[PDB]
Amino acid sequence: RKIQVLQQQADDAEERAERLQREVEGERRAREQAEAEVASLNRRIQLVEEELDRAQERLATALQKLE
Amino acid sequence: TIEAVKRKIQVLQQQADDAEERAERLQREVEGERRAREQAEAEVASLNRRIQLVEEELDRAQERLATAL
């Protein structure tokens, strides 16, 4: 009957560890989602910077055609 | 029967100790993944501010182009 107190203690400890193991997997999923957004924004900023370079290069041809 | 109770108690206490040590390792594992997540989230916020900056530089370039024509 003292064993049932110890058996419950071991049950609770194993349960907290399993609860934390699922916490690891949930944090890893959220990490991968944020890192996937980082990749998407990296691709998006490169495209607008390319659009800007062309917009300034076009501006240069128009200004250069002015002198 | 006497030793079987002293041994059942020992095996149950070793089980809880191993589980408690596993929990400490997993707590650091959680933090390792969270640290990496919040690093990415900070870069997301930075990339959103930079994209808005480039879009403003773009609008200034397109506006002057329309004028320069």
UniProtKB/Swiss-Prot annotation, chain A:
Mutation effect (R43C): Found in patients with undefined congenital myopathy; likely pathogenic
Positions where Phosphothreonine occurs in the chain: T61
Signal peptide start-end: none
Tree of life domain: Eukaryota
Positions carrying Phosphoserine: S40
Cellular compartments annotated: Cytoplasm, Cytoskeleton
Family (UniProt): Belongs to the tropomyosin family.
Recorded domain comment: The molecule is in a coiled coil structure that is formed by 2 polypeptide chains. The sequence exhibits a prominent seven-residues periodicity.
Illness the protein is tied to: Congenital myopathy 4A, autosomal dominant: A muscular disorder characterized by onset of muscle weakness in infancy or childhood. Most affected individuals show mildly delayed motor development, hypotonia, generalized muscle weakness, and weakness of the proximal limb muscles and neck muscles, resulting in difficulty running and easy fatigability. Many patients have respiratory insufficiency with reduced vital capacity. Skeletal muscle biopsy shows nemaline rod inclusions, subsarcolemmal 'cap' structures, and fiber-type disproportion.
Function as written in the Swiss-Prot or TrEMBL entry: Binds to actin filaments in muscle and non-muscle cells. Plays a central role, in association with the troponin complex, in the calcium dependent regulation of vertebrate striated muscle contraction. Smooth muscle contraction is regulated by interaction with caldesmon. In non-muscle cells is implicated in stabilizing cytoskeleton actin filaments.
SUBUNIT field: Homodimer. Heterodimer of an alpha (TPM1, TPM3 or TPM4) and a beta (TPM2) chain. Interacts with TMOD1. Interacts with TNNT1.
Name of the molecule in the record: Tropomyosin alpha-3 chain
Taxonomic lineage: Eukaryota, Metazoa, Chordata, Craniata, Vertebrata
Gene from which the chain derives: TPM3
Full-protein positions shown: 83 to 115 of 285
Curated annotation (Swiss-Prot), chain B:
Compartments, record wording: Cytoplasm, Cytoskeleton
Positions bearing Phosphoserine: S46
Chain positions with Phosphothreonine modification: T67
Comment, domains: The molecule is in a coiled coil structure that is formed by 2 polypeptide chains. The sequence exhibits a prominent seven-residues periodicity.
Family under the similarity heading: Belongs to the tropomyosin family.
Assembly and binders: Homodimer. Heterodimer of an alpha (TPM1, TPM3 or TPM4) and a beta (TPM2) chain. Interacts with TMOD1. Interacts with TNNT1.
Function: Binds to actin filaments in muscle and non-muscle cells. Plays a central role, in association with the troponin complex, in the calcium dependent regulation of vertebrate striated muscle contraction. Smooth muscle contraction is regulated by interaction with caldesmon. In non-muscle cells is implicated in stabilizing cytoskeleton actin filaments.
Associated pathology: Congenital myopathy 4A, autosomal dominant: A muscular disorder characterized by onset of muscle weakness in infancy or childhood. Most affected individuals show mildly delayed motor development, hypotonia, generalized muscle weakness, and weakness of the proximal limb muscles and neck muscles, resulting in difficulty running and easy fatigability. Many patients have respiratory insufficiency with reduced vital capacity. Skeletal muscle biopsy shows nemaline rod inclusions, subsarcolemmal 'cap' structures, and fiber-type disproportion. Congenital myopathy 4B, autosomal recessive: A muscular disorder characterized by muscle weakness appearing in infancy or early childhood. Most affected individuals show congenital contractures, delayed motor development, hypotonia, respiratory insufficiency, generalized muscle weakness, and weakness of the proximal limb muscles and neck muscles, resulting in difficulty walking or inability to walk. Skeletal muscle biopsy shows variable histologic findings, including nemaline rods, type 1 fiber predomination, and centralized nuclei.
Protein name (database record): Tropomyosin alpha-3 chain
Organism annotation: Homo sapiens
